[PDB]
Every structure is written in C-alpha cells, then in structure tokens.
C-alpha cells in the first residue's frame, strides 16, 4: 500500500497553475478525520438516555479534565466542514468541472447527502428544546407514507428509543463516508483535475514539493481559525435555545436552526403546500444530479471556459450564490408578510437559475 | 453555548469616587437620567401625540405601547454609556 | 408577535479578549444571589466544591455549606434524615418539583439559572437590561393582577415582580448597595457560574493561537521557497535565447 | 466450604422439548404467590399487562389490579396521592427499600423473584427441593434464634422460616391444598414468570430446526453430486488402459 | 439465562385418583416416606453410629451433620419418583 | 473488486484431499459476520448506565418483538466462535502448518488475542454480579504498574465510566478484527494451503464447484446447531449468577467463568505467586509465537509428516489437548487441596508439552 501512496500522493503530476481554490477538498477530508477523533473521545463519556443525556453533556464540561475542549472543537469543526464543502462545490459549478468529471460529481452529491444526515443526527444528541422540536419537525416532514414515521421514531413520539438509535446511526455514518471518499478519489484520479483556465496543457509538475506545501499552509490557517473560534467565541454560530431542557408540551418562542440549515428552513416558511415544500428539495437535488451528463443535452461541442471575467452578464452560479445567501437572511427572520414576499422572489430566482444551467 | 461573546475595542471606565461617602446610597441612574431624557425628546413628542389621538378617537380601541417602548429603549441606550463609571 | 429590541452593550470587565472575570464582583454577586434570588430560583448544577480556590477560601465555603439542612439516607431502619451540608453537596432548591414551583408563582416556572447567560440572546447585557426594565404601563394597556410591565422582556409583560431594592442586602468589603450595583455584581456572578472554566479556556487560547500564527508565518516562507523556482523558470522553443 | 448436593429431577410438564407450560398450575401458583410469598418478596419486573390472554382473562386481571393502592402524582399542588391500580402498573412491593427489608427480616434480604429459576442451579428442581427441605438439627449442631435448618440450602442454615402449611390457601378450580401441591403450583408459576416468552420460543424453534435439517439433507446430496465425479476419475501414465 | 434446561425421555405420571375425596387433605409425602426410609437404612445405621461415638468421646467437640445430610438426600431422591403421581 | 473475487474464491485451485478439517476458518469468519449483525441490532436498544443497564437488557426480552431472539443468538454464537477457533488452531498444531505459513500463524495469534479481549469486554455489559466481580479481578490482575488501573477503569473502582468505555471498545474491536482478517488471508494465499498428507502435489482442483459445496454443507450444520441450542437450551453454557443485580460489598458464593476462560482460571487457582500466574500466560503465548520460525532452531531439514497415525507414542499436541481439558475440569471445581494437587500436575504437563514442540 506504500507503492500506491507514492503513486498518488508523491509522484502524481498536476498543472502548474493550481491555486488555493483547489485545496479545499483536502481540507474537508481533514475536518472529517479531526471530527472523527473528537467524536470517539466524546462517546466514551456520553449517556444515551432521555432522562439524563443533557446532564451527561454538562458533566464533561464541568467535572472532567479538558472536558470542555473536545466538546467545543467538535461543535465548531462542523461549521468548517460545511463552509469548506460549499466553497468546494461552488468552485466546480464555476469551472463546469462536471463536464468530464461525471462520476466524481455524482459521488460528491452522495457525500453531501451523507454529511447532511450525519450533522442532523448529531444535532439531536445533546437533547435540548431545539433538538426535540427539530426532530419532531423533520420526522413530521417525511410523513406521506403510513407507519414509516412511528417505525423510524420507534414510538408514537420522539423518545429515548429514538435517542438510542440516533446515537448508533451517528456513530456509524461517518465511516461509510470514508468508504465513499475512497470511491470519490478513484473516479477523480481516473480522469485528472481541471485547470482554472480550462485548457489542456503539458506544463505539468509533480505534487510532493510544490502542491503539498500549499496544502500544508492552508491546513495551518484552518487549524488556527478553528482554535480561535473554539477558545474565544467570536461568532454566535449556534443559538442559545438548545441550552434549555426539553418540554414536550411547550415550544420555544423563537426558532433558528444551525446556519447550514437556514436556506432549507426559509423554503418551508414561504411555500404554501407542504408537499410543494418537500418537492422543491427533491427537484433541486435532481437538477444538480442532471449536470453529470450535460454533454448529451445539446449537439454543440462543449468548452469549459465560461468567460466570467470582466463580464457584465456575470454567471448563473454567482446569481445562485447570492440567491442562497438572501435565503439564509430570510431564514433567520420572523414570519411576516414582507419577509415572505421577498422570500418568494428569492426562491423563484434560486429555482430558475438552477434549471437554466442545462441550456447552453 | 458560550456564556458571552468577545467585543472588540471596549472602553473600561475608571471608578469616579463619590464626593461624599453618603453620595451613592441613592441610585446613580437618577443622575444620568435627566440628560438622556432631554436627548430622546422626539419620542416623548410622539408618545404624547398618540396619547391625545387615542383619547380622542372615541371608537374605544387604541394604545401607544410602540412609542413608549421606543422612548425607553432610547433612554436606556443613552444611560448605558456612563452608568459603570459610578459602580465599583 | 414582534421582533424584540436589542440591549445596549455594557463594559463588563470580562468581555475583552485578554481579561478574566472580576472576582470581588463575583463574591458580591454570590452574596446577592443567596440573600435574594435563591428565594425562587435554583442552580442544580452547582456544588460548593466549585467555590474553593476560584472565588472563596475553603474554610469560609465549609461554613457556608453548614448553614443548610440537606436530606440523606436511608439509615439502619430504612428512614431518611437531615444533616448539615458539606462541601460535596449541590446547592439547595426552594421547591420539591416543578408543580409546586408553579403553584407558588401563579402558574409560571422560575427557570434554573445554572446556564442562564448562555440560554438567552446577548446574555449578560440582556440580564442587566431586564433587571432595569420595570416601568408603568403605557396608555391603552392594562395587565391582570400578578403580572408586571417590563420594557426589555419579550412581549413586555412578565411574571417576576420588580427584583431589586436599595440596601435590601449588604456587602462585606464595604461597597455601597443600590439596585444598579447589585445588578452588575449578580450578573457577574451568574456569568461566572455559567462556565467556571472560562479563564482557563482563554489563557490556553492565547498561547495556542500565538504559536499557531508563528507557525503560519514559517510555513508561508517554506511554501514561497518552492514557489520561486518554477515561477522564475525559462522555457525556450527552437533555440536558446539567454543564459 | 463444601460442594452442596444436587436435587432430584421432578417431571414438571414443561421440561420436555415438545411441551408448553401448564396453565391451570400457573393460575394456582399465582394465587399462592399472592396469598403467601408476596408478604416479603417482590417481582419488580412484572406488570398486570402480562397476565391477560396468557394466564387469565382481561376482566379478572383488571379486578385483581383494583385491589391495591398505587402511588402517583404530583398533582396541581405538587403533592403525591394514591389511586386504585390499573392494568398498566407493576406488581406492588412490601418494603420501600432494601434497608427496611433487612430491618424486618433480621438482617437478611429477600431476593426479587422476577428471574429466580434462572438465578439458581437446577432452577425449579432446586426450588421444589428447597421448599421440602426443612428438618430438625443434627446431633452436634445448634442454630441461633431466627435461623432454621434446611437440608437443601447451601450450608444448611437458612433465614427463611418454614414456608408452607396445609390449607393455608384455597383454590378456585377445586383442587385440594397441601404443601406438596402448593410447591408444585408455585414453582410452575415462578418458572413461567421467569420468561413468559417460553412457549413462543419453543414453537418457533421446532419449525426452524425441522426446516434446517431438511435443508441439510438436500445440501448433503448436492455436495456428493460433485464429490462423485472426481472420486471416480481415471488418470493413466504412458498409455491408455481402459475405456 | 434460561429458566430451565430440557431433559430427554422424562416420564410424566397419570393422576392416580384419591380413593376418598378427603384422602389428600393430608400430605401425600407421608405415604411415600416409609418405603424410602426403609431403603436408606445404611445411612440411618451410620448416623446412629456417629451419634453414639460423638456422645462418648468426652473431649467435648463433635457432630454428625454429614451422615444426616446423606440420609435425607437419599430419602428425598427416593420420594421424588412417585410424588407427582398424587398431585394434579 | 469483482476480478479479485473471481481470482481468490472461484478459480483458486486447492488439493483434492482437503477434508472437513480445513473448513473451520470459513466457519469462524461466518460466526464473526453473524455476531456483528446481532451486535449492531442489540446496540439500538441497550443502555450504558450503571444505574439501569441490567433492566435495559431485560426490557429487550420482555417488551420488544423478537427481542429475546437477538440476545440469545448473540449469547450462544460466542461459544461457537471459540469452539471453532480451537478446532482451527489444533488442526494446524497437528499438521505443523506453521513450518511454512509463518506470518499466517503470527496473524492467527493476534486474531485470537483480539477475540479474547472482545469477548471479555462483552461479558461485562449486562452488568450482573459475575460481570462486576470479573472486571474487578481482571483489572486487579494487571496492577503491577502504578496508576494504570485507576486510569483504565476511569475511577477508583469499577464504575459507570468503566461501562461506557467498555461499551465503546466492544463496539470498535470487531471491525479491527475484520481488517486483520484481510491481512491473515493475504499471508495465507501468498503461500497456499497444506494437505492432510503433508506432501506437495500437482493433483489440484478448482474451488467453486467442489470445495464451495462442502463449505456450504458445514455452514448448514452450524446454523442448525446454533438455533437448536439458542431456542431450546440443551446445555448450561453460562452460569446463572449473572442473573443477580450487582452488589459492591458482597461476592457470589460460587464462581465459574464462561467455559472458554476456565483453563486460565484454573492456573490462577493453583500457582502461589500472582506474578507467576501472569507470567505463565505470557510465557505460553510467547512459546506459541516462537513456533513461527521453527525451521531455524535446528539444522536437520524439516518435514510436515508427524507420523501420528497408529503411533503408540501419540503426539505432543494430543497431550496438550488432554491437559487443557483436564485444566477445564479443575477450573470448574471448588478450591480444595486435592483439586489443587492434580491441578499442579496438569499445569506442569501443559507447560512442558508446549515447550517441547521446538525440540525436533
Ligand atoms: C483572501 C481570500 C481568503 C479566502 C477564505 C475563504 C473562507 C475560508 C473558510 C474556512 C477556513 C479555511 C481556512 C483556509 C482559507 C484559505 C487560506 C489561503 O490560502 O488563502 C489564500 C488567499 C488567496 O489565494 P489565491 O492563490 O489568490 O487564491 C486563488 C483565488 O481564489 C482566485 O481564484 P481564481 O481566479 O481561479 O477564481 C476561481 C473562482 C472559484 O470560485 C470560488 O472559489 C468561489 C467561492 C465563493 C464562496 C461560495 C460559498 C459561500 C457559502 C456561504 C457562506 C456564508 C458565510 C457567512 C459568513 C458571515 C461572516 C460575517 O474563485 C473566484 O472567482 C474568487 C474571486 C472572488 C472575488 C470576490 C470579490 C469580493 C469583494 C468584496 C469587497 C468588500 C469591500 C468591503 C468594504 C467595506 C467598507 C465599510 O490568499 C490569502 O489569504 C493571503 C494571505 C493573507 C493573510 C493576511 C493576514 C493579516 C492578519 C492581520 C492581523 C492584524 C492584527 C492587528 C493588531 C494590532 C495591535 C496594535
Ligand atoms: C463426526 C465428527 C463431527 C465433528 C464435529 C466437531 C464439533 C463442531 C462444533 C462447532 C459446530 C460446527 C458445525 C459443523 C461440524 C462439522 C460437520 C461436518 O461436516 O462433519 C464432517 C464429519 C467428518 O468428516 P470427515 O471428512 O471425515 O472429516 C475429516 C476427519 O476429521 C479426519 O481428518 P484427518 O484424518 O485429516 O485428521 C486430521 C486431524 C486434525 O486434528 C483435528 O482437527 C483435531 C481437533 C480436535 C479438537 C480440539 C479442540 C478441542 C477444544 C475443547 C472443546 C471442549 C468441548 C466440550 C464439550 C462437552 C460436551 C459434553 O483430525 C483428527 O485427527 C480427527 C480424528 C479424531 C479421532 C478421535 C476419536 C475419539 C473416539 C471417541 C469414542 C467415544 C466412545 C464413547 C462410548 C460411550 C459408551 C457409554 O462427518 C460427519 O459428521 C458425517 C455426518 C453425520 C451426520 C449424522 C446425523 C445423525 C442424526 C440422528 C438423529 C436421530 C433422531 C432420532 C429420533 C427418534 C424418534 C423415534
Ligand atoms: C420570586 C419572587 C423570584 C425571585 C426572588 C427572583 N425570580 Fe426570577 N423569575 C421568577 C418568576 C415567577 C419568573 C417567570 C417570569 C415569566 O414571565 O414567566 C422569573 C423569571 C426570570 C428570568 C427569565 C427571563 C426571561 O426572559 O425568560 C430571569 C432571567 C430571572 N427570573 C432572573 C432572576 C434574577 C437574576 C433574580 C435575582 C436578582 C431573580 N430572578 C429573582 C421568580 C423570581
Ligand atoms: C417472609 C416470612 C418470607 C416469605 C413469606 C417468603 N420468603 Fe423467601 N426468603 C425470605 C428471607 C428472609 C430469605 C433469606 C434467606 C437467607 O438465607 O438469607 C428468603 C430466601 C428465599 C430464597 C433464596 C434461596 C437461596 O438459595 O438463596 C428463595 C428461593 C425463596 N426465599 C423463595 C420463596 C418462596 C417460593 C416463597 C413463597 C412460597 C417465599 N420465599 C416466601 C423471606 C420470606
Ligand atoms: C463528519 C463527521 C461528523 C460530523 C459532521 C458530526 C457532527 C456533529 C454535530 C454537528 C454535533 C452537535 C454537537 C453540539 O450540538 O454540541 C455532534 C455531536 C456528537 N457527535 Fe458527531 N459528527 C461527526 C462524527 C462523529 C463520530 C465519528 C462520532 C463517534 C464515533 C461522533 C459522536 C458524537 C457525539 C457523542 C456527539 C454528542 C456531543 C454532545 O453531546 O455534546 N460524531 N456531531
Ligand atoms: C467529504 C466530502 C468531500 C471530500 C473529502 C472531497 C475531496 C476531494 C479532493 C481531495 C479533491 C481533489 C483536490 C481538490 O479538488 O481539493 C476533490 C475534487 C473534486 N471534488 Fe470533491 N470532495 C468532497 C465533496 C465533494 C462534493 C460535495 C462535490 C460536488 C457536489 C465534489 C466534487 C468534486 C469535483 C468535481 C472535483 C474535481 C474538480 C476538478 O478537477 O476540476 N466533491 N474532492
Ligand atoms: C466477534 C464479534 C463479537 C463477539 C465475540 C462478541 C461477544 C459478546 C459476548 C460474549 C457478549 C455477552 C452477552 C451475554 O453475556 O449475554 C456480548 C454482548 C454484547 N455485544 Fe458483543 N460480540 C461481538 C461483536 C459485537 C458487535 C460488533 C457489537 C456492536 C456493534 C456488539 C455489541 C454487543 C452488545 C450491545 C452486547 C450486550 C448484550 C446484552 O447486554 O445482553 N458485539 N458480545
Ligand atoms: C477470526 C479468526 C480466524 C479466521 C477468520 C481465520 C480464517 C482462516 C481461513 C478462511 C483459512 C483458510 C481455510 C481454512 O483453513 O479453513 C485459514 C487458514 C489458516 N489459519 Fe486461520 N483463521 C482465524 C484464526 C486463526 C488462528 C487463531 C490461527 C493460529 C493460531 C490461524 C492459523 C491458520 C493457518 C496456519 C492456516 C492455514 C493452515 C494450512 O494451510 O495448512 N488462524 N484461516
Ligand atoms: C491542489 O490540487 C490538488 C490537491 C490534491 N490534494 C489531495 C489531498 C489529493 C489526494 C487525496 C487523496 C488521495 O488518496 C486517498 C484517498 C482516500 C483516502 O481516505 C481518506 F478517507 F481520505 F483517508 C486517503 C487517501 C490522493 C490524493 C489530490 O489528488 C489532489 C489533487 C490536486 Cl489537483
Ligand atoms: C477447504 O479448503 C479451503 C477453504 C477455504 N475457504 C475460504 C472461505 C477461503 C477464502 C476466504 C476468504 C477469501 O477472501 C476474503 C478475505 C477477507 C474477507 O473479509 C472478511 F472479513 F472475511 F469478510 C473476505 C474475503 C478468499 C478465500 C480459502 O482461501 C479457502 C482455502 C481452502 Cl484450502
Ligand atoms: O421548524 C423547524 C424547522 O423547519 C427545521 C428544519 C430545518 C431544515 C431541515 C432540513 C431540511 C432539508 C434537508 Cl435536505 C436537511 C435538513 C429540517 C428541519 C428545524 O431545524 C427546526 C429546529 C427546531 C425547531 C423548529 C425547527
Ligand atoms: O476469580 C475470578 C477470575 O479469576 C476470573 C478470571 C478468568 C480468566 C480471565 C482471563 C485470563 C487470561 C486471559 Cl488471556 C483472558 C482472560 C480473567 C478473569 C473471572 O473471570 C471471574 C469472574 C467473576 C468472578 C470471579 C472471577
């Protein structure tokens, strides 16, 4: 397995002009490994009982040596997982990477779905108000089929049984992640990476000396920033309301998911029919999947240059990003008619600019 | 999760000694309130206006909790600048 | 429903990146909490062990714990009994269950304060504002008995009576007592109690971030060291130009 | 210490591989348990839900549960109260804690019987022997007050008094009462209570094992089918012998 | 783990009716005990022997719990063969 | 990975005369896979708290559909894991497999150590008397080093913290098992299996039709027997005393480990010095390890035929087996002088007949 190590991470030859925007994959992998370490060492002292989970998490912070550090590293590294993934996705929307990296793009989408599931399962385990009512909402959202929801819950309502199986599932999924990562990289190195210029070039250079050092530099920056936020708390990434014990008969008066879930939340606020809601997610994900075979949707021969530099027309990916940010903004606010109106405007933009990527 | 979040470039007051050991048996807020009351006069104006109009309309529904809330938020946001100079 | 207003930022000593907690304020806040706020609230997560060396000397903390009767048992006959508190025991609570707490407070439940500043927006600034916030009703509004108007509580109507009163308590260091001072000191105490590991966390943070930044400079230099050899390369086609 | 003796094997109806439990015996054993053994023992794992359809009809089980006061609450005032038992409640217990149980039984602890036959060697045969085992001391041995001699208990000295007495209880089907009969019926009841899923388990077992054995025959035939083609092969060196 | 373990080739008795409805107000064991008492006579012999020797030795220490235990284990292992014929 | 599947499990060519004694590896692997399935589905409802673990296991049996079946399959398949492993080891002691399958034999030993650890960790999780006092004993046995025992416990005595970390460790170790199994098979197929005759032969035959069916037949038998014992309870494999709740100040009056641990227990009964005790285990395992390079311990050229058929001298492996069985017998009984005497006789036999394997 050493010979493979050398073939793929030492003698592998890249293009000279790979700048930082091509370093974020490595970064998400590293946040995965790190999150796994802190996960396992948190599991050694966590209690999976509805009667006492909350106090179990508080015991780590209050009465255990370095107890606070692992919880906070685990909490904060999640945000960086998602931030790095979104940068990593947008880079390849910008470049039209999926033109020839077909199966890599598919694998990517599967990994993103895995990550969403993993995060949301994690989000229930500390067992506060937000956890209980979030679980209630998302389980009610997948109700269309009889008996599936009491079965997956384990029970007529969110329960200790639900906590136990969420804990086991959150244990298992990351490692399935890892396996799919190996699959991802297989498809990638089958083809070879693209340039920022989107041309084919013979001016290649080996990995170990030049690109490995850039990977290391960015890694230093990321470790830095994680520790800064973890130790000092600069930003209010997580809302305070998960600090309150659960009550099964009273909701919290103000509700804000974790930031990486706000856009979705915005949709659930503005579309009238609940099924329309769910179908928007399904449709957008199907549209992203459809990009894998964009070469077939037209008989003009395709190029990877999108000529977005100096261009007054901008590009659909940029409009997508700004629409998504606008949806995050509206996600965060209270339900009111005007917020809903601009919500619907932004939603139409978000859907249309995704549909239109296929129309070259 | 955190008890608080750090704020940049905060200014920390020096404890202004009371001129009389008895001087702060009475709440220092009372000595900062007048000035701020004078600074937030437009909210007083609008609250009195709404009070008049509510008392007049005669269809027997009305209130001026909005403008009152704004008035007192203004006054408090003014007082907060100097109150910690008088506390140890 | 409405968007509630946002409190002003007070210059608490701790909210700087290099500052610790302010221990005399913490002592005074603890004294306030014992004499007043512990009448209806609870801190189930706190034990007297937590005060020795961090806030108070051990001897005094033992003497504090001795003031309470704490239940224990069973004994040889299977009966329960009461004993003087010890350093290992958690803080006492005024009600045996939530139902009794609601019964004594007209239906509302006084929340446990073990994490209170981490369980609200703007934390200590919100709490400082709330304790100042009691005022007379506006024109066109009236509140039913046992309910009060406060300009910082959401929806403006709150079940907790006006909280503070001058010289309702007294200080051992000599500081004069008034509602503003009591507000500052008790907010300091509760902020500390929300996470006693704060100062450890921050002091460790400083070393970590500083060293990591020095690291970052060194790695930047190492990366440029290899950048320059290919950024400055010459490639000619056909024949040699320069040497 | 010594190796204790081993009990004789009694022909309980269940200890065959094809037999179920014997439900009339179970009913009578439950009646014995209620009238006698529940004076000092407990079965914390049993709820009345368990008896309907398996042993007794639902109506009768509800009427049984109604005989007990069961504690519940808190109420609106945060006080606890007592109510008539319901089908969903666990069996009651005679002592509030282990210390009281020891206090009432001269220091020894009456074990909980929810798994008793699975928690001893030879299970029901041991229990049947033990209930018969009380006898006078041998020459050269005397036991201190509140202690008894039993020829099947390990070390021969036991804290439980002689357990059974003729017509100390009565049966509703008409069967005559005596200590031997009560022994058999209560041992049946406790063996059932140790795992009510027994009959389900055995009836499923039978189908499973039978089908798997038929499987095994078929696979044996399939394996020999391929064995024979190479076991009967011919290999010659140099020239062909037979054809 | 299991409540019991299966035994092969067990023999299950038919309920011998009592000759008088009153006949089993008295414990059936009493009707099986004599025979077994006669079968375990060697243990009675040895127990009486030990009783004599213990009463004689005069150094004031001795007991015959062993032989007693053996006697009663024998008697019980005999009774167990027929007791379930008399119980429903 | 399909091409590898075909190369190693379909077209791979064996010797014609491989009888059933060469089928037990496959069998232990299958008991591993099966034990993993039942493990995971037991984890979904188990509680890792000292206050309530016991009742958590009872809830599965009493109130859950098919609850009893998974617990009992998991309990009973362990015995078959160990029985198959011991047959599998003795086969290769009998044949002198380690003559040329050097690294395979080493890997085997590591896998057996992993299995012992996994089983013992499992044995504590139901949290009865035997579990608590077994954990106490084995943790006291590895005391020679300061502070290591309170550290590994987590505490001054066996505690809920100990349960939590035992549960996580018991979760993890089997999968490390699986990885080492892949390593095992690599070393094996690097060389190729031995015959019962211990000769080299060209009369080979492919795997898929002939040997695959024998594997399947034995698999049927094993599934049969597991279900027989699981559903009807023919043998008292596990002692009743784990059915009693824990008491930290009172031991159980009679003590019998699980059968696959009795021989070890016997040693701890008969050797006076505790360190001598531990050193016997260390020494015997080192001796087994030493067999990997038996070709070097002598200058006579080695053969695999041990000529044990019809032989009045028998062989050291058979004496080893009978000594081990005798030690199991004595393990089971009470501590008494005569049992200890025959114990020491059997112990000397067990040690000597292991030392002597190197003396050809
Ligand atoms: C600087 C950038 C930093 C990026 C960070 C990203 C965030 C990371 C988060 C996660 C953590 C990862 C950590 C590693 C980060 C990377 C590090 C790195 O190597 O950076 C390389 C980076 C750029 O390298 P490069 O080789 O040029 O990269 C290639 C380019 O990308 C060019 O590539 P290309 O040309 O091939 O293009 C491909 C394309 C590919 O596409 C993409 O990649 C697009 C991706 C877009 C993001 C999409 C996802 C978004 C998802 C939503 C996120 C929401 C978050 C919400 C957060 C809210 C926060 C409030 O990319 C682009 O098109 C990018 C161009 C975008 C232009 C946007 C222009 C915006 C203008 C804004 C003006 C604002 C004016 C304000 C005025 C206000 C007045 C009041 O260089 C540096 O950072 C240099 C080092 C600088 C160090 C300075 C340190 C100073 C410290 C001072 C201390 C002072 C102390 C004082 C004390 C005093 C005491 C007295
Ligand atoms: C039959 C054997 C079965 C083995 C089972 C093993 C245990 C398995 C446990 C785990 C479960 C696995 C399941 C699969 C098992 C394998 C199945 C299989 O394929 O077997 C093949 C097996 C043998 O195949 P093979 O091709 O000859 O094998 C090659 C040979 O091994 C020859 O190989 P080689 O020549 O190359 O030699 C290499 C060497 C390699 O070395 C080894 O492999 C040595 C391994 C030794 C074991 C070491 C580990 C021990 C660890 C300690 C374990 C302690 C457990 C404690 C258990 C206590 C239980 C109480 O092996 C040997 O030397 C072996 C020879 C040993 C000779 C020992 C002689 C002992 C004589 C005893 C006489 C007793 C007389 C009692 C008289 C009493 C009078 C009162 O054949 C069969 O079993 C044929 C099928 C028979 C089916 C009969 C079914 C009848 C059902 C009747 C039902 C009736 C119902 C009635 C109803 C009535 C209604 C009215
Ligand atoms: C009994 C007279 C009390 C005393 C003394 C203190 N508190 Fe309390 N508090 C009490 C009640 C009945 C309630 C419920 C209010 C409601 O609207 O339901 C409260 C509430 C609080 C809160 C919650 C504020 C929020 O926005 O939810 C806080 C932060 C609080 N109280 C703090 C507090 C402090 C600091 C006290 C000592 C100065 C104190 N309380 C005393 C009852 C009583
Ligand atoms: C109070 C008078 C009791 C009644 C009625 C019953 N039991 Fe009990 N039991 C009691 C005590 C004080 C003890 C402790 C004995 C000791 O030596 O410590 C026991 C013990 C048992 C046991 C344990 C036997 C063993 O080998 O450990 C069993 C199996 C048992 N008791 C069963 C039992 C049954 C079936 C009863 C109804 C017929 C019954 N007991 C009644 C106190 C009392
Ligand atoms: C990509 C990998 C992972 C991600 C993105 C992830 C995400 C999360 C998140 C967002 C939380 C919420 C923490 C909080 O709200 O404070 C969490 C908690 C938790 N995670 Fe994961 N996790 C990952 C891997 C793992 C692994 C591998 C394990 C264990 C093997 C694990 C165990 C836990 C535990 C025990 C908690 C509870 C934290 C607490 O109660 O305070 N995680 N995780
Ligand atoms: C755990 C999640 C992921 C990991 C660990 C990961 C890892 C990597 C790595 C290491 C690379 C090569 C170096 C680099 O580009 O930084 C890469 C490239 C790539 N990834 Fe990912 N990735 C992940 C998620 C995704 C997702 C969600 C997508 C798409 C939706 C995606 C699509 C791609 C593409 C298209 C490339 C190659 C682009 C090109 O060559 O031009 N990946 N990934
Ligand atoms: C070679 C693989 C394994 C072996 C030999 C093994 C062995 C054992 C043993 C002997 C027990 C004792 C059960 C009892 O005493 O009733 C046990 C229990 C248990 N095992 Fe494992 N195990 C294995 C794999 C696993 C895996 C992979 C998991 C989970 C991922 C797991 C989870 C459990 C649990 C939850 C229990 C508790 C059973 C109970 O409380 O009744 N096991 N195991
Ligand atoms: C989980 C435990 C184990 C598994 C899954 C396993 C699996 C296997 C398999 C599939 C084979 C080939 C087919 C067969 O021989 O049945 C094999 C062969 C072998 N194994 Fe194991 N084994 C295990 C444990 C061990 C142990 C504990 C030892 C030694 C102490 C060992 C030593 C050997 C040897 C020497 C061979 C080849 C013998 C020969 O070719 O003559 N294995 N093993
Ligand atoms: C800036 O430009 C680039 C940066 C690049 N950075 C990296 C880190 C790689 C890479 C990643 C993984 C890999 O092999 C592995 C697969 C899977 C594993 O498994 C797991 F989970 F990651 F540990 C480990 C290892 C081999 C190579 C690239 O190809 C790569 C390519 C370009 Cl163009
Ligand atoms: C009767 O005579 C024989 C029987 C034999 N039976 C078997 C089952 C094999 C075998 C096992 C595994 C394997 O490849 C694998 C490795 C590891 C895995 O991983 C895990 F964990 F097992 F699933 C899976 C798969 C390839 C082949 C043999 O070679 C084999 C050889 C002989 Cl002579
Ligand atoms: O009302 C909501 C709500 O709508 C969500 C939502 C956010 C989006 C989530 C989500 C949507 C789509 C995907 Cl692919 C993944 C997650 C589902 C739960 C919450 O997270 C929540 C948490 C706590 C209280 C209330 C709520
Ligand atoms: O006294 C013991 C004892 O000695 C062991 C022993 C058995 C052998 C074990 C063992 C020895 C060596 C190895 Cl490599 C693996 C396990 C360690 C625990 C027990 O298992 C036990 C369980 C419950 C109560 C008491 C006891």
UniProtKB/TrEMBL annotation, chains B, E:
<dbReference type="GO" id="GO:0005743">
    <property type="term" value="C:mitochondrial inner membrane"/>
</dbReference>
<keyword id="KW-1015">Disulfide bond</keyword>
<keyword id="KW-0679">Respiratory chain</keyword>
<dbReference type="InterPro" id="IPR003422">
    <property type="entry name" value="Cyt_b-c1_6"/>
</dbReference>
<feature type="disulfide bond">
    <location>
        <begin position="40"/>
        <end position="74"/>
    </location>
</feature>
<dbReference type="GO" id="GO:0006122">
    <property type="term" value="P:mitochondrial electron transport, ubiquinol to cytochrome c"/>
</dbReference>
<dbReference type="Pfam" id="PF02320">
    <property type="entry name" value="UCR_hinge"/>
</dbReference>
<comment type="similarity">
    <text>Belongs to the UQCRH/QCR6 family.</text>
</comment>
<feature type="disulfide bond">
    <location>
        <begin position="50"/>
        <end position="64"/>
    </location>
</feature>
<feature type="disulfide bond">
    <location>
        <begin position="36"/>
        <end position="78"/>
    </location>
</feature>
<keyword id="KW-0999">Mitochondrion inner membrane</keyword>
<keyword id="KW-0496">Mitochondrion</keyword>
<protein>
    <submittedName>
        <fullName>Putative ubiquinol-cytochrome c reductase hinge protein</fullName>
    </submittedName>
</protein>
<feature type="domain" description="Ubiquinol-cytochrome C reductase hinge">
    <location>
        <begin position="27"/>
        <end position="88"/>
    </location>
</feature>
<dbReference type="InterPro" id="IPR023184">
    <property type="entry name" value="Ubol_cytC_Rdtase_hinge_dom"/>
</dbReference>
<keyword id="KW-0813">Transport</keyword>
<keyword id="KW-0249">Electron transport</keyword>
<keyword id="KW-0472">Membrane</keyword>
<dbReference type="InterPro" id="IPR036811">
    <property type="entry name" value="Ubol_cytC_Rdtase_hinge_dom_sf"/>
</dbReference>
Automatic annotation (TrEMBL), chains C, D:
<keyword id="KW-0999">Mitochondrion inner membrane</keyword>
<feature type="binding site">
    <location>
        <position position="160"/>
    </location>
    <ligand>
        <name>heme c</name>
    </ligand>
</feature>
<feature type="binding site" description="covalent">
    <location>
        <position position="41"/>
    </location>
    <ligand>
        <name>heme c</name>
    </ligand>
</feature>
<keyword id="KW-1133">Transmembrane helix</keyword>
<comment type="similarity">
    <text>Belongs to the cytochrome c family.</text>
</comment>
<keyword id="KW-0496">Mitochondrion</keyword>
<feature type="binding site" description="covalent">
    <location>
        <position position="37"/>
    </location>
    <ligand>
        <name>heme c</name>
    </ligand>
</feature>
<dbReference type="GO" id="GO:0005743">
    <property type="term" value="C:mitochondrial inner membrane"/>
</dbReference>
<feature type="binding site" description="covalent">
    <location>
        <position position="40"/>
    </location>
    <ligand>
        <name>heme c</name>
    </ligand>
</feature>
<keyword id="KW-0679">Respiratory chain</keyword>
<keyword id="KW-0479">Metal-binding</keyword>
<feature type="binding site">
    <location>
        <position position="159"/>
    </location>
    <ligand>
        <name>heme c</name>
    </ligand>
</feature>
<feature type="binding site">
    <location>
        <position position="120"/>
    </location>
    <ligand>
        <name>heme c</name>
    </ligand>
</feature>
<keyword id="KW-0349">Heme</keyword>
<keyword id="KW-0249">Electron transport</keyword>
<keyword id="KW-0472">Membrane</keyword>
<feature type="binding site">
    <location>
        <position position="41"/>
    </location>
    <ligand>
        <name>heme c</name>
    </ligand>
</feature>
<protein>
    <submittedName>
        <fullName>Cytochrome c1, heme protein</fullName>
    </submittedName>
</protein>
<feature type="domain" description="Cytochrome c">
    <location>
        <begin position="24"/>
        <end position="176"/>
    </location>
</feature>
<dbReference type="GO" id="GO:0006122">
    <property type="term" value="P:mitochondrial electron transport, ubiquinol to cytochrome c"/>
</dbReference>
<keyword id="KW-0408">Iron</keyword>
<feature type="binding site">
    <location>
        <position position="37"/>
    </location>
    <ligand>
        <name>heme c</name>
    </ligand>
</feature>
